[PDB]
Design a protein around this ligand. Structure first.
Ligand code: HEM
Ligand code: HEM
Ligand code: HEM
Ligand code: HEM
Ligand code: HEM
Ligand code: HEM
Ligand code: HEM
Lengths: 145, 149, 147, 140, 149, 145, 147, 140, 149, 145, 140, 147
């Protein structure tokens, strides 16, 4: 419905900055996203058994979740630097290829991100801009169209 | 050792670190600073250049190394942002420890030098810097990441 | 359609969010998008920028031109509370544009429309009405003798 | 010689010291009062902007333009292509006026002094000196 | 609500105007300022001198013209002090409107000039002056008084 | 009991300044005086029909009352400038001659002013000085002894 | 009969009301009234003011003399909180009057009585007791060597 | 040339910058310290009032006498008759001392500078300069 | 006379006096200051040297006169610290009066001189000094101590 | 258990400084000590009839109590100056010789001082140091061992 | 000549003006900035302590060392045996450096000026001058 | 065993109580005791102080030396919150002791034990643990190249 262009990349960057936060807020944010993902595709949980996915309060899972948002952070932050973004998205792709992650999952994840962010920011967020840019980030991780 | 990177210690570290992202072009700052640190690391210990062949340190300004500079800066940002949650921090640093364990050549000596470079560099960017609090906190983190080495 | 005190105070709040970093990237891209918008709605205006090298849109002389505009606007926003200084400076800005033959009242209308269309895309909860009201007042003065 | 850390320090410290609306106006006035007090000859070239009355709206405008110009160059410390172009542009704007190159040295001397007041013992004098020196040289 | 001489606008105007009467010899200030304003008005539009014959503008310092200057200044004081009460202001400005209507020669052009003179003179006595707020508030007032011309 | 001399004029100028106020306080003050007048001589009300005297909250009435206190303000402010005062008093007298205003009315008005001013300032006012100076002002509006 | 700290504070609030405007009219008139009172009760004191032209009481030289007195008093009041400066200045004011042959303690008693009669007429809720205590203390020093 | 609006402005701004009890004492000290710092010869004529120690009560008394004097003249800006007499009076009080006419110029320079600090960007330099200049000339 | 060393007067004195004991070597300050005051008294009224023979004023720096310096300074301290309790103060000043009464040679003139010496010396050590408050308070104290002479 | 040497003299001086206070706190401090003494040795009360010891609130007793602490203050303050202390203690001894004050009383008084100071400072006080130093001071007042 | 009351005054006033942790740091920097501003030659002997950058941690340390030194001497104004020894010690530390004795006088002018700002009109200039003058003479 | 931010703050409170008065008596006597303790436990250290006259312990040259140490320590404590200045100064203090032959790591250990034995005798509610933690950290740097 909208493309991840200059302006929408600029917007998402700002809004991420504001939603992402730090310390305890970041842990909570990290958790809220995964829980929303799991609520939508409880199937996906089995992929996270090695990282105590059964319990989203387990420290090993917090680390994993913060680690994920860490990757998302690099991607969003370089939306305006295509070459760097490409290099980061390839690194991530290499780390997700081999795993059996159907589009179904990335799709739920995206919905979680958008859901939790909209909560963080109240009115001040653009759903269509986010949707486009997360889609764009996810394409590079899947390697699929 | 409850006085090494204590409650107030890590709270000072988090507050002072946070100032670096007061603005939106954080990636620009992350890349600049990260690139500077590792560039300096390689300068001091030439064998390090080989260790970063895969991330194309050869072209420090290139998109390859830029992404990597971000990956490390966020790695350090992850640890700092988890200082107020020791068990989660340990899980996080243990994970990093494995990631370096699986790299041939990387050794404790490298992490000691990095600590120094980092201690010199941080006050060059932060005008509010508790050398004592950063030192103890950075040691804890650097040590946990390099124990499997 | 007057620029009220509340509008000026509103614009200050808005402005903190568009005008972040002390790096140029963001203020290059937003103003570039504003100009792309202008050139789409008034394409003949694009010929006014050959001295600052639009032909080379990533040249640095053009990027710095974009920043000069960005900072000129930042200047105006930060004068919205020093109205006598503002009045004086607005004339200065007018004189700079009068000395560029080809700059018209119409093109200044167009940059207003460009800002109105672009700013809402860079930030949410943007009060476009309060922005237009004050931008029009600022433009009214800058373009007083332009046409 | 402004490395990456120093330009960044200057950027960060400028953001604090500069301030926003009326904060900038007060900064600019304090700065020019200091300069012109020390070197009253500097009023001469300011004939068109009421340099005889720094509290006038005309000089206030000029003063704001200057600080805004300084702001442009500080935000460009990390983009040499842009910095070069901007400094050239600024030079054009000063070149045809009887400005002794030392005027800019005096400007710098006072800029660092007022900045020291605003920022305190945290003022990265070394970083500023290096960094803005380059800017000054480009216009001088 | 509504952007022309808005809520905050008229509050800025009232606060700023009030500064003039901080001290008790307000007649002295009203007479000096009002005399200056009308004198400047007559200077710019010579026909104005005729309009003020009945009040002896010929002898600007005289008791006649002095009383009149108090009168106009209190008229302007009245309007400003009624800015936070739009319908009472309208009644007041309408009354003033009638009073000028019955004077032959007094025309809209005179009130446009007065506004300019007033805009120039006010910052000369008030070291705190929002030009935008005064401009819009003055315009509404001047337009209402001069509508019946 | 006391004449409107230099010192009483000085005192009344100051006490007027303090009681007169501004904005909503001035309106309330204006109304308090007219209500006190009407309470004392309700007959006088009929004189103000053209300016909505039947309703003291009416905006046209406020305007009128603010206008009256505006005239009084000029008079009090120039108690120390007899030549100017006379000229103002003559202007006002011209505006009142024609109207059938018995002394009885100027009398109630004076009582009302003193009453509202006494309330406004509590202890800190001099009734004898006010009485004398309001009389002096009213003598010039009536034109009578 | 000492001038207490409360008294000095009371006199400050009083003094804000007499000494208003940065115009001379009010302070010409109060001091004129004080002296009229002095001259009415101590007529021989009137002969001391010929150099400042009492003979032409609207003259400007005499009016300026009245302001100098007004401001001298304003100076004293505004020193009530800087007692060492006050102490020093008080001797200075003493010397100025000792060099005027003819000025007596009796006349300073009279001006005291004059202020006590006049001030209560220019302002209400005036604490004349507090005023007198402090004014006597001031005058005691000024007129120490006068008689 | 101090017209009606300027004298009014000066009167108003003076009312704020002057202040009351102790605020006057601090203003006066800051003023004389600046002056005597810039021109130490000026201590010589202040011999009778401890010009060597501006923090003394003797000099504080003198300082206060000066500001009170300035106060009189500012408040007479609108009454030429009184102003002429007062200025003549102040002149008598200055005439027999070896005061260089430029001393008053230095005084004005520093009065305006200290006033600037107190009043800030709102300081009507134009009005002050016109207005006090006339006062300085009457005593000079 | 309720305006002599009033409520606020004595409150000012106590506050300003307290300042001398901000630091812990108060004895040092008491001795130096008391010693200075009596020494000055002996200088101005020579007969006083005899009055202090028992306490060895001859060796003002000696332990004897030091102890005495403390005794007097603590006497003045006592009075000041009781200013907020007039009847207790009176009891204390009466006791002091008796103590000076039994000493031959001590006279009211000595107490007048001491008061002057005291009014001069206090501002030299206290940088916050209300001369008026101190004068009235010191007079009450000095008069009560010397009423029995 | 501890002798009043240099270090303990030092500590007592500081802690005394903190406990002694001024104005109303000092009056209360003085009364608290005498009440604590009287509570332990009510017999001693008869010694203070001249100074209204029957009523510890009586102004004459406050004066006496402040006077005592005045003397104690000198003693404590000069713990580090033995020659001056000896001089002060001799002066006090002369004022107490002839009075029938058994060791019993000096002992209760010392307990009182320590009890009130301990309350004044909570934990921050050294009882053994105070004990040794008050002992040393009392020895000089008694003239006894 | 610093008598008992003046030394006591200086101690008390020093206690306030000096301050504690970072309050000292800002004081010392403000002082040396004023001094080196007035007299750039003074940077030369400060070569080892980065006198060219007074905001550096090296000069910050030297500055703290100085104020701590001033603090010893002030606390010793009443003990002549100790003062004599300490001033001798300080002299030793200054004697083999091309320090014009008037450098110390400039130091005093500026110490008094900055202390003046801190303490205000309560500043016992007379006492400070007498007192510190003595400390300076012992080092000079 | 690291000197935490809490320790450093804790020490700031403690320090106000040992380092009172702007007279030297208290700071001569405490440091004197610290050294007496040092000489009792490491008597060969006493020989390092002949130049400052330990032989005449009441001499003034010796007492001033005691004060120099006191103020030196006071400097360190007042720097606990300016860590970069601290880092620098610590090096300076190190160089002053390196230049005195005979000063060893052992003696600095000994002064540490001296302070921990003595300080708790001058003030109560002393947190010796926090003190030792920070004191060791300071001494570690000063004595880095000493032995
Ligand atoms: C937009 C999105 C995503 C980003 C930026 C992202 C990023 C990351 C990052 C940075 C890691 C850690 C790399 C490492 O240090 O080992 C990670 C691990 C992983 N991710 Fe993702 N991811 C994303 C979406 C998903 C989705 C949708 C799934 C499937 C539900 C998924 C499944 C995993 C798994 C299973 C691991 C490994 C956990 C383990 O270590 O045991 N990721 N991802
Ligand atoms: C404060 C410390 C450090 C942090 C937080 C850190 C973090 C990281 C992270 C997050 C990665 C990427 C892991 C991934 O593949 O996703 C990484 C890779 C790496 N790190 Fe570190 N690191 C740190 C210090 C060092 C030091 C001192 C060395 C020097 C030997 C080093 C050598 C490497 C190498 C060789 C790689 C692999 C580069 C490649 O992709 O080929 N790291 N580090
Ligand atoms: C809201 C509005 C605008 C602002 C704040 C603005 C600001 C500026 C500033 C600060 C400069 C640089 C002046 C100098 O230092 O040389 C500039 C130059 C210029 N502007 Fe604008 N401008 C605005 C709108 C326009 C519009 C609508 C046009 C017409 C399309 C326009 C055309 C130009 C041209 C042709 C130049 C000169 C370029 C060159 O040759 O260097 N500007 N403007
Ligand atoms: C902001 C503006 C003004 C206010 C508040 C104002 C108010 C007044 C008032 C209160 C009176 C006296 C009414 C009465 O009691 O009879 C008056 C009279 C008059 N005004 Fe204005 N006025 C304003 C502007 C002007 C201007 C611009 C003109 C010039 C054409 C003007 C021309 C007159 C004349 C000719 C009279 C009659 C003088 C006479 O008594 O013969 N006024 N005005
Ligand atoms: C001390 C007193 C008084 C002063 C200063 C005073 C002043 C005024 C003023 C300034 C006006 C408005 C003139 C205009 O602009 O049209 C006015 C109008 C009027 N006054 Fe008075 N007045 C006083 C007493 C009275 C009294 C006692 C009455 C009778 C009870 C009265 C009856 C009127 C009437 C009927 C109007 C005209 C109302 C209308 O416009 O319809 N006044 N007066
Ligand atoms: C503000 C005033 C003074 C206070 C509070 C004061 C207080 C005292 C005190 C507490 C003592 C010791 C009493 C005792 O315990 O035996 C004392 C002794 C004495 N005082 Fe004063 N005194 C004051 C002024 C004077 C003055 C002005 C004189 C001058 C004649 C003076 C002469 C003496 C003498 C001669 C002794 C006896 C010394 C001895 O032989 O021990 N006092 N005073
Ligand atoms: C350690 C402590 C003591 C100190 C420092 C001390 C000090 C004093 C002082 C300064 C006076 C007043 C001398 C004067 O100015 O006349 C005094 C009086 C007296 N003391 Fe003590 N004293 C101490 C212990 C005691 C004890 C234990 C007793 C017996 C319970 C006691 C009984 C008296 C009596 C009876 C008086 C005379 C009261 C009067 O004036 O009638 N003292 N003492």
């Amino acid at each position: 419905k909208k493309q991840c262009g200059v302006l929408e990349g600029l917007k998402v960057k700002s809004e991420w900055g504001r939603a992402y936060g730090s310390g305890h807020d970041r842990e909570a944010f990290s958790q809220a996203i995964w829980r929303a993902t799991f609520a939508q595709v409880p199937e996906s949980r089995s992929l996270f058994k090695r990282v105590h996915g059964d319990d989203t309060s387990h420290p090993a899972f917090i680390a994993h979740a913060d680690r994920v948002l860490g990757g998302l952070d690099i991607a969003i932050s370089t939306l305006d630097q295509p070459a760097t973004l490409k290099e980061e998205l390839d690194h991530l792709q290499v780390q997700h290829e081999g795993r059996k992650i159907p589009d179904n999952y990335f799709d739920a994840f995206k919905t979680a991100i958008l859901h939790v962010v909209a909560a963080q920011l109240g009115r001040c967020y653009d759903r269509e801009a986010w949707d486009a840019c997360i889609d764009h980030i996810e394409d590079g991780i899947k390697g699929h169209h | 050792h409850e006085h090494c990177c204590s409650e107030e210690d890590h709270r000072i570290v988090q507050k002072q670190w946070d100032i670096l992202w007061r603005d939106t072009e954080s990636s620009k700052i992350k890349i600049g600073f990260g690139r500077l640190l590792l560039t300096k690391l390689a300068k001091d210990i030439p064998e390090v250049n080989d260790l970063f062949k895969r991330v194309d340190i050869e072209h420090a300004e290139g998109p390859k190394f830029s992404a990597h500079a971000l990956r490390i800066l966020n790695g350090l940002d992850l640890a700092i942002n988890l200082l107020d949650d020791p068990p989660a921090l340990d899980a996080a640093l243990d994970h990093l420890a494995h990631q370096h364990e699986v790299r041939e050549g990387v050794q404790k000596a490298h992490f000691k030098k990095f600590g120094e470079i980092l201690a010199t560099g941080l006050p060059q960017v932060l005008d509010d810097y508790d050398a004592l609090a950063w030192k103890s906190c950075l040691k804890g983190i650097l040590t946990k990441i390099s124990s499997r080495l | 359609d007057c620029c009220s005190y509340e509008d000026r105070r509103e614009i200050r709040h808005i402005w903190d969010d568009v005008w972040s970093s002390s790096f140029t990237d963001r203020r290059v891209a937003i103003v570039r998008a504003v100009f792309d918008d202008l050139f789409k709605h008034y394409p003949t205006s694009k010929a006014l920028f050959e001295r600052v090298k639009i032909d080379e849109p990533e040249s640095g002389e053009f990027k710095s031109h974009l920043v000069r505009v960005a900072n000129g606007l930042k200047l105006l926003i930060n004068l919205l509370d020093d109205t006598l200084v503002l009045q004086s400076h607005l004339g200065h800005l007018a004189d700079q544009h009068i000395q560029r033959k080809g700059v018209t009242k119409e093109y200044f209308r167009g940059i207003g429309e460009a800002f109105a269309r672009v700013l809402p895309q860079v930030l949410s909860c943007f009060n476009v009405d309060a922005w237009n009201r004050c931008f029009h007042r600022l433009v009214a003065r800058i373009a007083k003798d332009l046409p | 010689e402004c490395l990456v850390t120093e330009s960044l320090k200057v950027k960060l410290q400028w953001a604090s010291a500069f301030g926003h609306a009326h904060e900038r106006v007060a900064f600019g006035l304090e700065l020019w009062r200091d300069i012109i007090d020390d070197h009253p000859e500097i009023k001469a070239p300011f004939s068109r902007v009421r340099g005889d009355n720094i509290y006038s709206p005309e000089f206030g405008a000029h003063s704001q333009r200057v600080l805004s110009g300084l702001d442009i160059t500080i935000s460009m410390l990390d983009t040499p292509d842009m910095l070069a172009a901007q400094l050239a542009h600024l030079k054009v704007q000063h070149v045809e006026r009887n400005l002794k190159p030392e005027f800019f040295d005096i400007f710098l001397k006072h800029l660092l002094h007022v900045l020291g007041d605003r920022l305190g013992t945290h003022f990265d004098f070394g970083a500023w000196h290096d960094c803005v020196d380059q800017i000054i040289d480009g216009i001088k």
